[PDB]
Amino acid sequence: RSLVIISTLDGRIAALDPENHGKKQWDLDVGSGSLVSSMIIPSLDGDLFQETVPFTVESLLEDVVLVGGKSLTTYGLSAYSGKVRYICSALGCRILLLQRTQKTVRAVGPRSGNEKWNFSVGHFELRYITVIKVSVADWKVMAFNKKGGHLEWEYQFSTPIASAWLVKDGKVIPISLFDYLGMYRGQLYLQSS
């Protein structure tokens, strides 16, 4: 019954049944695009590194002029069919809960107003109303059967991975991550592994 939910750098969400060998139940696109848009390299949560700078994505907003804003949007889908039930944001407010925090910041010249540089990171955090592990160097979900260590199933994602959780009978279990700086078709980022 339980599910394995993974957030890809595409900004997508996929549901894999950890029983029937990671059988994909559904995939989701929020329309808001990839988890990061762009030396300075950021974490998906907003931290900034170059090696560390005394600033976070928001510490800069508080030579150039900065603009940007953090957004907290919660999407509400069907737990197992994945079809949307409610979406809530500052826009308005038209069971698993998906809270996306997209941190953008734009440096802008004071007189002209044209873009200079900008960083737009994103991060997902989930709520709900064999020991599964993750290989981030391969963008793969791997469930290791506790008997002999031999895995039973795996699922491979074409896009690098940001976070993963198991929902083992109502509870939300965060899937750990093992073999920092990443990259998805261009831009680098950071994670806490």
Binding site: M39, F49, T52, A137, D179, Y180, L181, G182
Partner: peptide, 9 residues
């Protein structure tokens, strides 16, 4: 920088 290994500050 290398985008595929555990870096440390």
């Amino acid at each position: 920088p290398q985008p595929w290994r555990f870096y440390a500050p």
